[PDB]
């Protein structure tokens, strides 16, 4: 039961961290009207 909590916590934090660090990876530049 605690192991399931561990795995769910790890998965949730992994996906949230993917979202957060992805939007920090110069997201406004990833657009087709980029200057250079």
């Amino acid at each position: 039961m605690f192991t399931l909590k561990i795995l769910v916590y790890t998965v949730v934090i992994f996906f949230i961290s993917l979202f957060t660090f992805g939007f920090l990876s110069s997201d406004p530049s990833r657009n087709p009207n980029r200057k250079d």
């Binding site: 909590k5 561990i6 934090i13 961290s17 110069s26 250079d36």
Partner: protein
Amino acid sequence: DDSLGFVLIGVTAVIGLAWAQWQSYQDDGDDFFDTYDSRRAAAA
């Protein structure tokens, strides 16, 4: 593992070090005067 901050710290470290490796070759030190930064270094 009484507190559950080890999962938070550990996973955000692993993805954070991957993001830090990408950030290392970003030549973002110079400041820009624009609405958004168009500079993004690709292929290392």
